[PDB]
Amino acid sequence: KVFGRCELAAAMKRHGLDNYRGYSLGNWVCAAKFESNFNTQATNRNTDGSTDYGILQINSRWWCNDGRTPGSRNLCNIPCSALLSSDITASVNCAKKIVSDGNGMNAWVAWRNRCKGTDVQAWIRGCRL
Ligand SMILES: CC(=O)N[C@@H]1[C@@H](O)[C@H](O)[C@@H](CO)O[C@@H]1O
Numbered sequence: 001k002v003f004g005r006c007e008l009a010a011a012m013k014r015h016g017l018d019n020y021r022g023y024s025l026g027n028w029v030c031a032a033k034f035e036s037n038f039n040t041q042a043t044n045r046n047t048d049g050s051t052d053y054g055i056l057q058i059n060s061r062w063w064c065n066d067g068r069t070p071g072s073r074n075l076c077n078i079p080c081s082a083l084l085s086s087d088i089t090a091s092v093n094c095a096k097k098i099v100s101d102g103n104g105m106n107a108w109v110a111w112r113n114r115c116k117g118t119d120v121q122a123w124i125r126g127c128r129l
Pocket residue numbers: 044046052056057058059098107108109110
């Protein structure tokens with residue numbers, strides 16, 4: 001599923017991502033835009049053999065299990081395919097644990113390089129929330 005800008009913002013707000021650990025809703029929509037282009041089925045191969053999955057490109061090296069990343073962790077206790085669903089519930093709940101381990105949203109490289117320090121509210125402007 002390819003989310004719309006306002007459609008994803010409302011789904012993220014309903015799942016409690018607005019101001020979660022001090023990160024306004026514009027940060028999560030901006031991150032999902034530059035990580036997956038609002039595509040829930042987006043996957044990308046990392047150089048170390050791990051794979052990023054879903055709307056937020058959650059890596060399999062730590063958070064999910066895909067069966068081919070040897071020596072990795074499954075900290076979110078989910079199959080990585082559950083992150084590719086049109087229901088972003090699994091990706092949201094796992095992102096809440098990732099953003100809470102100390103580094104915040106810096107765990108998403110796209111957010112650090114393309115959203116951090118910018119006007120993130122412009123990603124939710126004009127949306128019925
Ligand atoms: C929280 C999370 O899984 N972040 C990943 C990270 O593993 C990696 O640096 C990158 C790979 O392209 O994409 C995402 O930012």
